[PDB]
């Protein structure tokens, strides 16, 4: 009856590294990105990522120190040692950066930046605006104004490249 | 409510199914709990993270 | 930003996000990405008659935020 | 005059030094040595000045 935890099951532990050791210095960044529990990246050795929080945009290499960034509706940039770059967009989130050379970012909903479309993002741009007028009350402006935001920022990364 | 207990079924292999359990405190004891993590040696794997 | 004034939880704030997201998305991928916020579920308790009597402690479509 | 910006370096060495204890406890002893090892390196400049003053005033 001694009911197995389910993160047992889960030995892909974190790698956590204690404050006296000696220091290391890395030239990769094991990142592991998922999308509504389902990883696109598995502990990828990656040059940097960029990732936009609430306080403003983070450029995370190896050997960053240990932080919880609570991420916003933006893209995500990874650069790999190579000389190649993955742009994704995610919609929300946290991203916990490790000293030990790990960034595991976990959002909500992350989809290429190319399956997203300009026009589509347009029209409801301007719905949102049409119906952010005839807002029932106080709780569905805040609502359009949340959707007019995110579409504003996939507008702006698709039209930054 | 002290915790909450979420008992479901996990999947092994195609036959191999047995019952797991996630366990949420309470945030509120959690916040005490992630005190200790913080200054305590004790909870070392949970000392970065904590912090 | 300003919806957390008006008492919306975190969480609600992410599926909305989500919600737009997923309808932004092409016609081609729509097809896999919004089967993942579609909320086709409810809330009961079986009664003394049988019925299950539905509650409403929580909304279920972002519309009733 | 000069010990006024020796004085208040010493405050802001110890300053940061609250800050740092408090996000990571366990490394205390590096930052404390750190704080007294920099505290003898503006104290010195406080020497400095308080020669001078001695020579000016007792010559």
Known sequence: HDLPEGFEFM????????????????????????????????????????????????????????????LNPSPLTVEYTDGTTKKYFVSGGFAHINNEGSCDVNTVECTLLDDLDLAIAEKELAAQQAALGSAKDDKAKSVVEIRISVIEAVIAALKHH | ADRYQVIFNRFVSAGVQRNAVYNIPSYEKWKEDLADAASSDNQKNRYLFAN | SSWRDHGISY??????????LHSTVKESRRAKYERWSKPCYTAQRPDGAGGQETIDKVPIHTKDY | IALAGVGLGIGTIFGNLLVACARQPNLTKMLFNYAILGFALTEAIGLFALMLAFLMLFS
């Open chain 3, 11 to 20: 969480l609600k704030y992410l599926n909305v996000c989500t919600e737009t």
């Open chain 1, 11 to 70: 030995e892909h532990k974190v790698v956590n590294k204690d404050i006296h050791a000696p220091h290391e210095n890395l030239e990769t960044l094991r990142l592991t990105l998922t999308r509504q529990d389902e990883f696109l990246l598995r502990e990828e050795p990656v040059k940097c990522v960029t990732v936009t929080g609430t306080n403003g945009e983070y450029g995370i290499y190896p050997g960053h120190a240990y932080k919880i960034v609570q």
